[PDB]
Nucleic acid binder design. Structure first.
Ligand SMILES: [Mg+2]
Ligand SMILES: [Mg+2]
Ligand SMILES: [Mg+2]
Ligand SMILES: [Mg+2]
Ligand SMILES: [Mg+2]
Ligand SMILES: [Mg+2]
Ligand SMILES: [Mg+2]
Ligand SMILES: [Mg+2]
Ligand SMILES: [Mg+2]
Ligand SMILES: [Mg+2]
Ligand SMILES: [Mg+2]
Ligand SMILES: [Mg+2]
Ligand SMILES: [Mg+2]
Ligand SMILES: [Mg+2]
Ligand SMILES: [Mg+2]
Ligand SMILES: [Mg+2]
Ligand SMILES: [Mg+2]
Ligand SMILES: [Mg+2]
Ligand SMILES: [Mg+2]
Ligand SMILES: [Mg+2]
Ligand SMILES: [Mg+2]
Ligand SMILES: [Mg+2]
Ligand SMILES: [Mg+2]
Ligand SMILES: [Mg+2]
Ligand SMILES: [Mg+2]
Ligand SMILES: [Mg+2]
Ligand SMILES: [Mg+2]
Ligand SMILES: [Mg+2]
Lengths: 229, 119
RNA sequence: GCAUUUGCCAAAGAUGUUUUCAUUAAUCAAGAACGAAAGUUAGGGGAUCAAAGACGAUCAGAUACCGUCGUAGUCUUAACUAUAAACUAUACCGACUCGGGAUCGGCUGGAAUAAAUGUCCAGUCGGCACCGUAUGAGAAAUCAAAGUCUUUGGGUUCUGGGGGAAGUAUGGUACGCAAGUCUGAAACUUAAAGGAAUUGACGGAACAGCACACCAGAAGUGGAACCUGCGGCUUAAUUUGACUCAACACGGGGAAACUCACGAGCGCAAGACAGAGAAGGGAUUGACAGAUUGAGAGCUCUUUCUUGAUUCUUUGGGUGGUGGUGCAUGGCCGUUCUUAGUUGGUGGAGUGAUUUGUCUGGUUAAUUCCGUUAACGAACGAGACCUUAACCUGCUAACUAGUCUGCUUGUAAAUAACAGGUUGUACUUCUUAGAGGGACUAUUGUGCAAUAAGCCAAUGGAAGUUUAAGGCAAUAACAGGUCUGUGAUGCCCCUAGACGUGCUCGGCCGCACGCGCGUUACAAUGACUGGCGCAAAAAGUAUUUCCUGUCCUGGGAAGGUACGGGUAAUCUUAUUAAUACCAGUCGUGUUAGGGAUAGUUCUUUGGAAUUGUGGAUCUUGAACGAGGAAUUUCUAGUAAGUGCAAGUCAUCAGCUUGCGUUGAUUAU
RNA sequence: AUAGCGUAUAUUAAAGUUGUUGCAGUUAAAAAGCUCGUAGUUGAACUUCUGUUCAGGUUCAUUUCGAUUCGUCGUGUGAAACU
């Protein structure tokens, strides 16, 4: 059973090669619950040179304890980052009693959590947006992270963890600032992620004009969906 | 201790669900019906299922039953429930308005629409 | 901090202003006014309580909680003192960000009446709050501020910078009569101390389940003799494991030898395999006979004759070990517990550990179901499953079951009755036991259930307590038990007068006592003497050995071996049990109740019975007159009584595991 | 790491753990028991707004164009904030 049968309307729309690009899903803000939709846009034919290669990384694995009916019952938590270096990043975490299990479930989670980082210009606008449009802030638990845009080739100035996240996002050049208890790795990761996410939340002056008015994919593709397969 | 279990009630639901047109108030009929219709590994089991399903036939004869949705019988029951007289209650040409309703109609200006009787 | 009436004195907010002034304001080192209680000084006052104190009680000790007293205090004038968890632990002035009723004080309209210092309604200003809610905040608890904070700046005082040291030392032309207040260190030492919240565990908190836990009862143990385990105590040795359920008639643990580990005294090697030496001109084995010994153990000693590498001496080293270690371990097994519990996926909630699911409530033996439902569906466990028991005058058949039919035989007047023997293209009620039925809580119920799960009753039914009684037993544990069940083992120990393998005699059974299972009784619902065609379930011969049927002998337990059957639905046997019943004796007293303990005889199993293996006959006849504090198990063919088998086993049941017979009281 | 490399001590970043930028003070250390108040710090709104015309650049845009060239220049025209 290596063939994917979509349980989501969006899932159908994706598998059958109807919705064009991933970012489009992001645009119409269609919830992705199915961790297939994502592997779709990232083909496993394995051409080594694409920067659109989708990357997975285990970050954390934690032995979590419970006190239950006189026993001490351990599970594992894990954190996972997924990203193509080009614009797209997700973070996920899962608890399970078997390690490789926690890992798989967390990969799946992270995929469901995919988010569109926005890339801006520091100084004069020439070629590759190497950084963020504004300064922004992640907040998780106690922790805070501030992302400030840096000039060309500054590189990522940031702790090992948020650095890893940012590299997955494909921010080349950045300045970091962190508050809170940062050694809480899940909160640090979370913060960096949410921060990276807020890039598109910020209304910058270039976003000021009237947007395009389009119909949702579902309204256009309504005919397709109501055929019975 | 005669409380009946999960397996049995799921079973009975299913058996009625698909077969209601075939089923009788008689246990001895329904048990044979079940036997033909299904794979039941035990005599005892089948009989428990048949008994409960019979019980539920009787409960269905009386009215609506939670957990079982017989769409055919429910649509028949729905057509049953409609009865319409020719006059309705709703008379467009004669309608009665409170004092306060009248005040709001004054506000909109509709106080004088044809066929409006104040009370 | 302020709560009785009235009068007086000055003061205050809010509201109401088409009044006046016109920045006069905000906050605040100096400096000042207050400031609970307790305490201090000088007078008063003194009823209540009441530090100190005096006593009672409690307690191991109480200089405490409790009780009887009682001083200072408590109250009051003048004065000091300045401190509290002086608490919203939350600085003041100012903006701005949600919703909703209500409340206290003004005012503004409106409405009703019994027409007012009263009601109601709608506004609004100011107070004290509350209830929702935040796509605001926070580590959270929580917060309409604790919001408008890395998108960080409205104004202003104060305070903090890990924990202790320590509010200590010291200095105060700072205070105080004093107590003390205010100011206030460092050395030194230390990795944590600390905050919220989660899950457990626990509670001398609240609530709710369930179980013979208790309730209504019964049989009783605990009291007695004896039996059999533990512990003590003797012992050469009294082998040993196992101590609350979850050790202690448990280790199949009923031991005369054996078993067997303990004890005393003796014998063997089954010390392989390798290296060195020795050996064929001899390694080594054996053994008459005399001593010797418990012993025809050639064990030893004298005595030589055999025997012919099966190897001997060392040096290494393996076999073997009921020797240690269950806290090195496997396996198995107890126990929580047969209780009803335990998970995960996808959705919901938390930054998170985690949570919901898995629940208020009914209902069930059951997280069994119904229903509630941010949860939806599922898995394990329970159920189902499986075994035994209960129903079939219907099926399939039976000489290794029975019935009938027809013949006969005996006793009899016998197509009577009761018994045998035969019989058949016979038959299935009884008996085997295969197939298939059957029960599902069925039918009914203006019975209780919020009409849902379910419970209840009556009827039918072989069967309606989950039909009954069982087997199986999740997740997790408990360093539970087991090296002594294992040729499952790690590690440790013993290795030739061995902790190896044998033989002989003891020992585990030894008795002032303590503690457990139990058998038997204390009698009249009884004991004893007769009579009486009532069971079930188990077993059974490697041929004489195993069940045993006739028969004979003996007064008896038991012996013959005379005739026989059975490896068994055929034979023991479809019997042989005992309570029970019917007669008769005995007559409420240590009586024949009760028989412990003893002495002769006889028999049986075993080489061996002494330290009585069991059984038989005469004697002998104890405690015990219904059991203190305590406490066990148990709801129907059930308890209780009553015998029978099987395991053990040559012999030995007061034990165990089962089997029926007679059959309850009381709950449900 | 490397002809260098350990160690001790003061000091710098790490430290938004001294904080003007920039911290905390309901419960983690932290709002003074409470008012008055001088120094100090802090302070409501109003006054030549505005419009019209000229020029100079400086920027901007580009359906104005041009010239040449590897990009500046000239020019439009309007559009700005200026001066
Ligand atoms: Mg930091
Ligand atoms: Mg005085
Ligand atoms: Mg005393
Ligand atoms: Mg007194
Ligand atoms: Mg009025
Ligand atoms: Mg804060
Ligand atoms: Mg939040
Ligand atoms: Mg609130
Ligand atoms: Mg600030
Ligand atoms: Mg013994
Ligand atoms: Mg060995
Ligand atoms: Mg031995
Ligand atoms: Mg889950
Ligand atoms: Mg989840
Ligand atoms: Mg979440
Ligand atoms: Mg729970
Ligand atoms: Mg319940
Ligand atoms: Mg469910
Ligand atoms: Mg059962
Ligand atoms: Mg132990
Ligand atoms: Mg004989
Ligand atoms: Mg017999
Ligand atoms: Mg004798
Ligand atoms: Mg005797
Ligand atoms: Mg025997
Ligand atoms: Mg025994
Ligand atoms: Mg504290
Ligand atoms: Mg000004």
């Amino acid at each position: 059973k290596n063939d994917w049968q979509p349980q989501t309307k969006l899932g159908r729309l994706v598998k059958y090669g109807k919705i064009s690009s991933l970012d489009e899903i992001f645009k119409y803000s269609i919830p992705i619950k199915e961790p297939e939709i994502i592997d779709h846009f990232y083909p496993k034919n394995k051409d080594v040179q694409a920067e659109h290669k989708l990357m997975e990384e285990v970050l954390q694995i934690t032995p979590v304890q419970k006190q239950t009916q006189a026993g001490q019952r351990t599970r594992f938590k894990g954190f996972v980052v997924v990203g193509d270096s080009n614009g797209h990043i997700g973070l996920g975490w899962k608890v399970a009693k078997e390690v490789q299990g926690a890992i798989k479930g967390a990969i799946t989670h992270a995929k469901l959590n995919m988010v569109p980082v926005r890339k801006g210009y520091w100084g004069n606008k020439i070629a590759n947006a190497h950084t963020i449009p504004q300064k922004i802030t992640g907040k998780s638990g106690s922790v805070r992270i501030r992302l400030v845009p840096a000039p060309r080739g500054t590189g990522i100035v940031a702790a090992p963890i948020p650095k890893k996240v940012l590299q997955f996002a494909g921010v080349q050049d950045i300045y970091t600032s962190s508050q809170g208890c940062t050694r809480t790795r899940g909160n640090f990761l979370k913060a960096t992620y949410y921060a990276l996410a807020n890039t598109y939340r910020y209304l910058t002056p270039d976003f000021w004009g009237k947007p395009e008015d389009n119909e949702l994919p579902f309204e256009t593709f309504s005919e397709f969906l109501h055929t019975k397969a | 201790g005669r409380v009946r279990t999960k397996t049995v009630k799921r079973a009975a639901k299913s058996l009625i669900e698909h077969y209601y047109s075939k089923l009788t108030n008689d246990f001895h009929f329904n048990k044979k019906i079940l036997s033909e219709v299904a794979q039941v590994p035990s005599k005892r089991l089948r009989n428990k299922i048949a008994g409960f399903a019979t019980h539920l036939m009787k409960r269905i004869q009386k009215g609506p039953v939670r957990g079982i949705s017989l769409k055919v019988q429910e649509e028949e029951r729905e057509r049953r429930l409609d009865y319409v007289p020719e006059k309705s209650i709703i008379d467009i040409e004669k309608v009665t308005i409170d004092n306060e309703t009248k005040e709001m109609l004054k506000k909109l200006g509709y106080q004088n629409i044809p066929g409006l009787v104040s009370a």
